C-alpha cells in the first residue's frame, strides 16, 4: 500500500529524475524501506540515482518514464560528463536485461555503451517502452 496516492511510478520503475542544479538523471523508484531514512511524503517517490547510488525524495510530478529517452537524454552532460556516462551504461544494463534484449560484443565502458545507447535512442526496439516495466 505504498505509493498508493493516485499519482504515476511505483516500486520498481525506471525513471528521469530531475533535481535542482543538475540535467535529468537516470533512477529507480525504490521502497522507503531500501532507503534507511524515512516513509516517503505523499505524492512522492524515493528514488535511486544510477550510477551514484544515493537515494532522494523526489516529487511524482519532477519524474519521467525513462522510456521517454530522446527528449531527456542530456547530449551536452553526456559528452562533458563521466559519471553521466557511468550511469547511462548502468541504467541502461537494468533495461536491456528487463527487455531481453542482447547486443554483440565480446571491450571498454563506451565499447558496450554504444549499441545500448542507439538501442534506447531509437525506442527500445522491438519490446517498446513496455519491455522496460519491473518483473
Do not use: C
Not at 12 to 25: A, E, P, R, T
Not at 54 to 70: I, P, Q, R, T, Y
Not at 91 to 119: C, H, I, N, Y
Amino acid at each position: 500500500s505504498e505509493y498508493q496516492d493516485g499519482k504515476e511510478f511505483g516500486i520498481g520503475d525506471l525513471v528521469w529524475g530531475k533535481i535542482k542544479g543538475f540535467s535529468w538523471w537516470p533512477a529507480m523508484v525504490v521502497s522507503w524501506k531500501a532507503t534507511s531514512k524515512r516513509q516517503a511524503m505523499s505524492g512522492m517517490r524515493w528514488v535511486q540515482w544510477f550510477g551514484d547510488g544515493k537515494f532522494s525524495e523526489v516529487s511524482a510530478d519532477k519524474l519521467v518514464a525513462l522510456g521517454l529517452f530522446s527528449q531527456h537524454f542530456n547530449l551536452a552532460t553526456f559528452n562533458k560528463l563521466v559519471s553521466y556516462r557511468k550511469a547511462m551504461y548502468h541504467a541502461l544494463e537494468k533495461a536491456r536485461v528487463r527487455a531481453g534484449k542482447t547486443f554483440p560484443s565480446s571491450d571498454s565502458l563506451e565499447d558496450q555503451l554504444k549499441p545500448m545507447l542507439e538501442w534506447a535512442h531509437g525506442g527500445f526496439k522491438p519490446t517498446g517502452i513496455e519491455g522496460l516495466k519491473p518483473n
